[PDB]
Design a protein around this ligand. Structure first.
Ligand SMILES: CC(C)Cn1nc(-c2ccc(O)cc2O)c2cccc(C(F)(F)F)c21
Ligand SMILES: CC(C)Cn1nc(-c2ccc(O)cc2O)c2cccc(C(F)(F)F)c21
Lengths: 238, 9, 231, 10
C-alpha cells in the first residue's frame, strides 16, 4: 500500500502536489447582497470546491485503498472541516478577516444570527495558526488527518479497513515530527507543537458541527440556494 | 448518489 | 501560576488526587427501554456529577488562575465532553456496554428504543473499544480529561499549561518504557480521539436540546443553564 | 447570574 512505504519527504511532496486550487466566488462589489445572497456565495463556492476535494482525497496516500463506501463516508463526515481548515490557512495573513476567496475577503461585519460566532471561531483559529507560524507542509498533513480521522469511528472487512487508516495516521504523525525535527525544534518542542496542532482539530470539528446545524437551518428556511450535492452531504449528517 | 459517482470518476 | 512549576510526577499526583468519585444511579432493578426512564436516570446522574466536576476543575493546575468568567466559559463548553470521556473510561472493561454507573450498565439495544440515540451510543462504544485496545492508563486518562477542560473553550496561560500537560503525557509514556517513536505516535492517537469526543458532545447537546423542547422529562436549572450556554 | 458562577466560589 504505497502510503506505508513512502518516506516522510515523499509523503509531504505527494500531499503538496495534490493540493486543490483556490476558487473564486461570484462576489461583485457593485451588486447588492442580502444576508441570504451572501450565504449563497459561500454555499455556491463550497459546492464547486467539493469536486476538487474529491480529487484531492484520491491523492491522499491510503485513501484510494479504501472501499468506495468507506471513501464516501469519510468525505460525508469531513467535507466542511476540510473547507474550514482551508479557509483558516489562506486567512492567516489577513488578521481580523476571513479570505473565503481571493475576491471575497470578509471581516465579521451580513452574518445572520449565531453565524457570527462561528465566524469569530474561524478568525480565532486562523490567528492561532498565525501565532504558531504554521507551515504549508504541516497544513497538508493536518488536512489529510482530518479526512482519515473524522469518520473512522461490522465485518472486517470493516475492522480491517480501520487498522489501515490507523497505520496511515501513524505515518502522517511521523511526517509531522520529521518536519519539526528538521525545523530545529527540540524534542520537547516537537511533542508540544504536535499536540498544539492536533488540539486545533478539536476546534475544527466543533466549528464543523455548528456549521452543519446552520446548514440544516438554511435548507429548512429554503431561501439560500443549496446544491444537490450539498443537500446529499447534509443528509449524511442527519 | 452524487458523491458516490464523483468518487468513481 | 503554580501549575508551571510542577514536575511531571507532581502534575500527575495533583490530577489523580482531584479525581471525582464514580457515582451511582437510582437503585431500581429496572433496565430503561424508554426515552423517559433513560433520560430520567441520565439527567439525574449528570446533575450530581456536575457538582463534583466543578470542584474537580478547581483542582486542575492552572484552572484556578483564570478569572471566574473564564472558568465558567470553559466548563460550559466542556462539561458533556468531560462526562463522556469519563463514561468511556469506566466502560473500557465492559465491551459492548456503556457503564453510566456501576448499577447502570446500558447496551445498544436500550439506546435503540430512543429516537436518534443509538448512533451516539455506538460512537461511545467505539471510543471505549479504542481506549481498550490502546491500553489507555488512568494517568493518561486524567491528563486527557484536563486537556479537554482547558482546550475546548480556549477561544497564553492556558496554552502554557496545555504544553505542560503534554510534557506530562510524554513523561508517562516514557516512564512506561515506550520508545520516542511510540511516544509521539501514541500522543497523536490519544489527541485525535479528543476530536471524536468533541463530535459526540455536540450531537449529544443537540439531543439534550430536543428533550428540553419535547419536555416530558424535567431538567435541573443547572442542566438548563449549561444547555442554554450552547445556544 | 448563573448557578455555575455560585458553585465555582469557595
Ligand atoms: C464562515 C461560516 C459561513 C461557516 N461556513 N463556512 C463555509 C465555508 C465555505 C467555503 C470555504 O472554502 C470554507 C468555508 O468555511 C461554509 C459553507 C457552507 C455553510 C457554512 C455555514 F455557515 F453554514 F456554516 C459555511
Ligand atoms: C447518548 C447519550 C447517552 C448522551 N448523554 N450522555 C450523558 C451522560 C450522563 C452521565 C455521564 O457520566 C456521561 C454521559 O455521557 C447524558 C446526560 C444527559 C443527557 C444526555 C443526552 F442524551 F441528552 F445527550 C446524555
Amino acid at each position: 500500500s504505497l502510503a506505508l512505504s513512502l518516506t516522510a519527504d515523499q509523503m509531504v511532496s505527494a500531499l503538496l502536489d495534490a493540493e486543490p486550487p483556490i476558487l473564486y466566488s461570484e462576489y461583485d462589489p457593485t451588486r447588492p447582497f442580502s444576508e441570504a445572497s451572501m450565504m449563497g456565495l459561500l454555499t455556491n463556492l463550497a459546492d464547486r470546491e467539493l469536486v476538487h476535494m474529491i480529487n484531492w482525497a484520491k491523492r491522499v496516500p491510503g485513501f484510494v485503498d479504501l472501499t468506495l463506501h468507506d471513501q464516501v463516508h469519510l468525505l460525508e463526515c469531513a467535507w466542511l472541516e476540510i473547507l474550514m481548515i482551508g479557509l483558516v490557512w489562506r486567512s492567516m495573513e489577513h488578521p481580523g478577516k476571513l479570505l473565503f476567496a481571493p475576491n471575497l475577503l470578509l471581516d465579521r461585519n451580513k452574518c445572520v444570527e449565531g453565524m457570527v460566532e462561528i465566524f469569530d471561531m474561524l478568525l480565532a483559529t486562523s490567528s492561532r495558526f498565525r501565532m504558531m507560524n504554521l507551515q504549508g507542509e504541516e497544513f497538508v498533513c493536518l488536512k489529510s488527518i482530518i479526512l482519515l480521522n473524522s469518520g473512522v469511528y461490522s465485518t472486517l472487512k470493516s475492522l480491517e479497513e480501520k487498522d489501515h487508516i490507523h497505520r496511515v495516521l501513524d505515518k502522517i504523525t511521523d511526517t509531522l515530527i520529521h518536519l519539526m525535527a528538521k525545523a530545529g525544534l527540540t524534542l520537547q518542542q516537537q511533542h508540544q507543537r504536535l499536540a498544539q496542532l492536533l488540539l486545533i482539530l478539536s476546534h475544527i470539528r466543533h466549528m464543523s458541527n455548528k456549521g452543519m446545524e446552520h446548514l440544516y437551518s438554511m435548507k429548512c428556511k429554503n431561501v439560500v440556494p443549496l446544491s444537490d450535492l450539498l443537500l446529499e452531504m447534509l443528509d449524511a449528517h442527519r | 448518489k452524487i458523491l458516490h459517482r464523483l468518487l468513481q470518476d
